[PDB]
Design a protein around this ligand. Structure first.
Ligand SMILES: [Mg+2]
Ligand SMILES: [Mg+2]
Lengths: 495, 499
């Protein structure tokens, strides 16, 4: 009915939660604790070894990117906050004592959107999903006696009907690995950071279950674009919506802000990087921009942003000057536009239902972002080198999956034996493969499986699910270099 | 009964195109935000992600960037605790900080983020290499007082000729200064002359960690021994630093307040991180570490600092993976005892820290806290930095930087006219090698050279000296600007060891 941010900035935790009535200061310190938790996480440093667009120190990695993004998100936050202050609406919306947490949650959400991304990015994603799709064929789930699923337990046997449904969800879910979903899993089950509910909400960018099949509801198309959470994170996400008063398939407000921030940074950075990596020159870039635009009315957005960037940078290095100004001008037009977009739609963004991005529009601003994106896609991401690396990464991840396949091939009893006894005599290979998986991952497997009723007819299905989930955890946790090196060492191509 | 007005220290003016007049709280906030945007998007910061911290680059092992980032958070924590400790004492308004909370914390955070910015490849050993090479060329020893017959300086213009006395002094300062390359001094130079970020005066003050001129000779004043420990600025940054002290009301050889905060932060992060890293890189195990700590400490009054911090970390860990738990708790406990102690230390000495004269660190003490930091440091120095691998890499880096210096030596060997000719004509016919070497130097560096030299009166007897100075300064700029990997690869390429 209203807008009360005290009911959205939830400073409680999942375990050992702070309790009762807290002062402004004590809430501030709670969210500070969240900051210290995240910044000192292994997952963040691991970001410094994952590649952004290219694989050259001045070229950005997911860390320095996430860091520039952090600053853009903070800028947007502050502008929203003080535009609400100028409208004398802070107290009205419950934000008068939550300024700190507001900005901080945005900054940290920015800092860790990339946290759950696999090696080689979208192509590691691809590789994983294609491999598993070849093994599980979620397409074939009415039952067929020619069901191409290679896994005994997950085939649809005619008769058993609830079990068939669980089989459906398991197949689809395992075949929809996604970076964001993996990030929720990572932040909850594998790292056990025990963040505030608000922070976790800040991560949850899409709201579609990975096990989802068919067309998504019309009114939620944008929010259910990609999978947001896995079948295993389900009860946790339910709990999360309960704690942040989110409707089914709805989103946490602050997310929009960070998402906006993301877009902005990445766009200009990519062009800059393309000029460091020599893919095209500055004047050439200015030309591709000027052409792709095309509608030059006197005093439009392109003139201000791009053409003024270009005009200044020609008289102290010209390339750096041009991109500095391009970033500045872009930010100075787009950040307040995003802010205003947020405020003008605050009721629906607060309900978590608003089916649009802040910078998705017929706006000139939106068109400017699309301009940048087009120029990059046409003349940067098509650079033969970028594509070589994409092909390579796909082979490396497909290959690691093939190497560890022996573990997914074991029977329930055999694998359980392997988990319990540690070193099994009649499975030398599978044993050593198993020990190569990370400790945290194996613990997560053990914990998940131990929570299941072992006499239930569902048990073998859930176990296969959590085993595949173990393998995907392990592979998607690697840095590009590590995944590559592991693939080459295991393939006996190097020592 | 001196004064404490932070409005007179948090200077939000700039060197060029400065904002002017009477600004509101909000407009000042935006000024310092601008500073943040300036620094975070600098090439120098990303270059930090490719320079090594203690070990070489695993992923979970820290680099100067992720370190500087963790440091950023510790510095912010200390800042906030000082600020709200002053708020609880009802002293913000009293000290002029009531409208400068944002800038305070922000200046600390960004100073933390870029202390490492001016560091050479291979760290202290790149530093070593540079200074040793140049010392072999300039022998600043022979220029103390009294000119000499046997003056081993290989550079014609900078030998002390008996008679010319002002020139001899300038010669002295040039030799010493070129032979005292330092990361912090290079950072001031980097932030002013090479990057031209045009930060607020307060921010630049935040960088200036030591206050000794690199050209300094002899014992440093007794009352300033800690602040003049290492060189803080180069002979070329001199007029800038003068201007800086004028804008931040600093006495000669004095320091900017907030610096102490960041310095404290630095120490803390690095200490625990290193031990953690040593356990990732397998140098020793956790239980072994606990043992080396417990031994280096001494007996217990089960309730002393070691008990709380380390022993509670170890126990809380033991109830279980174990490694990560132990180091998480170790960091938490250390921070929770040391950060407020640092904060308190800052507030209890605020008059002298504000005067910029306070001759101590916040965590340099007979304090138990201080002793705990020293404990960590000792354990690392004995059982981590002595790991044969770390030392291999130190030796290697020294060879690489010594070698790059030898490769570019032909440029320092040219005469004034010849090098000038090379700068102006670009491609000179009778110097194929030197020409190509020159073009390999970075554009920003060469521009800085040209600008510096153009500022000089060309008919002055000082001119050839200043030019040689700014030329050496050009070479040191170029070499210290490299990442470890780049310096290494360039050295190998240029040596024809690979393509
Ligand atoms: Mg991103
Ligand atoms: Mg440091």
């Amino acid at each position: 009915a209203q807008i009360d941010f005290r009911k959205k900035i939830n400073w409680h935790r999942r375990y050992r939660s702070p309790q009762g009535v807290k002062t402004e200061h004590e809430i501030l310190r709670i969210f500070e604790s969240d900051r210290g938790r995240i910044i000192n996480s292994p997952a963040i440093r691991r970001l410094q070894q994952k590649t952004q667009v290219f694989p050259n120190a001045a070229v950005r990695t997911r860390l320095t990117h996430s860091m520039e993004v952090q600053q853009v998100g903070r800028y947007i936050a502050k502008e929203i906050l003080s535009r609400l202050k100028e409208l004398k609406l802070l107290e009205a919306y419950g934000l008068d004592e939550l300024t700190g947490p507001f900005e901080s949650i945005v900054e940290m959400s920015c800092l860790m959107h990339d946290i759950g991304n696999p090696p080689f990015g979208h192509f590691g994603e691809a590789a994983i999903n294609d491999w598993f799709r070849q093994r599980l064929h979620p397409e074939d789930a009415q039952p067929l006696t020619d069901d191409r699923c290679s896994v005994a337990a997950l085939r649809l046997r005619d008769g058993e009907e609830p079990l068939n449904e669980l089989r459906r969800k398991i197949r689809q879910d395992l075949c929809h690995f996604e970076g964001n979903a993996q990030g929720i899993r990572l932040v909850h089950t594998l790292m056990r950071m025990n963040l505030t509910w608000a922070q976790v909400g800040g991560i949850l960018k899409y709201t579609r279950p990975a096990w989802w099949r068919g067309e998504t509801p019309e009114t939620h198309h944008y929010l259910m674009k990609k999978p947001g959470y896995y079948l295993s994170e389900e009860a946790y996400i339910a709990r999360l919506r309960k704690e942040l008063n989110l409707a089914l398939y709805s989103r946490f407000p602050l997310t929009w802000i960070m998402e906006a921030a993301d877009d902005i940074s990445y766009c200009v950075a990519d062009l800059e990087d393309a000029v460091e990596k020599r893919i095209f020159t500055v004047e050439q870039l200015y030309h591709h921009l000027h052409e792709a635009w095309g509608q030059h009315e006197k005093g439009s957005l392109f003139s201000l942003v791009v053409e003024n960037a270009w005009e200044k940078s020609r008289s102290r290095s010209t390339e750096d000057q041009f991109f500095m100004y391009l970033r500045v001008n872009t930010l100075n037009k787009l950040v307040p536009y995003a802010a205003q977009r947020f405020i003008d739609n605050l009721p629906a963004i607060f309900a978590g239902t608003f089916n649009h991005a802040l910078l998705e529009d017929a706006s000139e601003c939106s068109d400017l972002l699309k301009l940048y994106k087009n120029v990059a896609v046409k003349h940067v991401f098509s650079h033969p080198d970028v594509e070589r690396l994409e092909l390579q990464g796909y082979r490396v991840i497909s290959g690691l999956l093939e190497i560890y396949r022996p573990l997914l091939s074991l029977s329930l009893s055999d694998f359980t034996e392997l988990v319990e006894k540690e070193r099994v005599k009649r499975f030398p290979i599978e044993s050593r493969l198993f020990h190569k998986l990370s400790t945290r991952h194996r613990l997560a497997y053990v914990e998940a499986v131990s929570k299941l009723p072992s006499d239930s007819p569902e048990f073998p299905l859930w176990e296969y699910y959590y085993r595949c989930r173990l393998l995907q955890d392990y592979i998607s946790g690697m840095t590009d270099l590590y995944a590559w090196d592991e693939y080459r060492r295991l393939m006996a191509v190097e020592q």
